[PDB]
């Protein structure tokens, strides 16, 4: 994740009053995985939209909880 | 984008679905008979929501806006 996207997401989070983070890739173009103490949030690279998690990969025959899988790697 | 979204929803056992626009690129709003989900155009990822617009003064819950619109 580049410095410009990270700044936008951080700037937004800070303007909203939500504090620390770990910003990670997401398997959806134009957005990133943001771990906060208010949950995992999927935030657009421009910082204008947040979608609350979790995210599921539903391309297969059963849903895969991608948020949980990444949390276990990142906590 | 809709056959791909429709196939995913059918696989999931969702019968009633209303596909609407979403203000995030690559995504649509799915209004089900049990609530709102966000799905990518290729139908491969779902995000639970809600969605907030945070371009202004404070977070605005646009999912709630969509729901109340019916």
Curated annotation (Swiss-Prot), chain A:
The domain of life is Bacteria
Q: In which compartments does the protein localize?
A: Periplasm
Q: What is the protein's known function?
A: Acts as a disulfide isomerase, interacting with incorrectly folded proteins to correct non-native disulfide bonds. DsbG and DsbC are part of a periplasmic reducing system that controls the level of cysteine sulfenylation, and provides reducing equivalents to rescue oxidatively damaged secreted proteins. Acts by transferring its disulfide bond to other proteins and is reduced in the process. DsbC is reoxidized by DsbD.
Q: Which family does the entry's similarity section mention? A: Belongs to the thioredoxin family. DsbC subfamily.
Q: How does this chain assemble?
A: Homodimer.
The name under which this protein is listed is Thiol:disulfide interchange protein DsbC
Source organism (scientific name): Escherichia coli (strain K12)
Full-protein positions shown: 19 to 91 of 236
